[PDB]
Amino acid sequence: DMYIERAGDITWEKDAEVTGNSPRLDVALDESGDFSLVE
């Protein structure tokens, strides 16, 4: 039995950690809501 707990406000924060890259991927989305790589 699941419950919720507040964890913060939804706000843009100036000078957050800037990280990760920006890849262009060919993907398929199946009926069970699972993405997969077309290749």
Binding site: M2, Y3, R6, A7, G8, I10, R24, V27, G33, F35
Partner: protein
């Protein structure tokens, strides 16, 4: 009866060892938004309050509680965004990234290349105006072994 304040929230279970974080969601205009695989459409407690599922779709991998999906902002296809990541047992933390692209036969989707525990599923992605443009948690493992999430957004009616 219940906590209705806007903001990000942890989704917890007591059904396993101790209290386990299964995911994250967004409270906006009285509606709770999370990913379907987090709750599988089950009801939620907020203190003595009950939250009932209202709308959901296993293929979009989204669900809304107490009302229709409210979040309609979209990635503009150009600007950097912030994952407001809420990892299990750790404080909410903004991370700024330039999204990549998922190319599908039904068209192009924003994608965030940021790896976090599955219990982070449901964490919101924000524009510079603080508007939720989608949720993190539905995506793919790449050749690297790393994880890339769709910017998953519902429809407002």
């Amino acid at each position: 009866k219940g906590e209705t304040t806007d903001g990000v929230y942890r989704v917890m279970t007591r059904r396993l060892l101790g209290s386990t974080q299964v995911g994250v969601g967004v409270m906006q205009e009285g509606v709770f938004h999370t990913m379907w695989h987090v709750t599988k459409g089950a009801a939620l407690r907020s203190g003595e309050g009950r939250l009932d599922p209202y709308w959901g779709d296993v293929k979009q991998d989204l669900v809304s509680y107490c009302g229709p999906w409210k979040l309609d902002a979209a990635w503009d296809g150009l600007s950097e965004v912030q994952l407001l990541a809420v990892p299990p047992g750790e404080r909410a933390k903004n991370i700024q990234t330039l999204p990549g692209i998922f190319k599908t036969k039904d068209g192009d989707i924003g994608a965030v290349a940021l790896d976090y525990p599955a219990g982070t599923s449901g964490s919101p992605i924000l524009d510079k105006c603080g508007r939720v443009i989608g949720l993190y948690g539905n995506g793919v493992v790449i050749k690297n072994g790393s994880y890339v999430s769709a910017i998953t957004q519902g429809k407002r009616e």
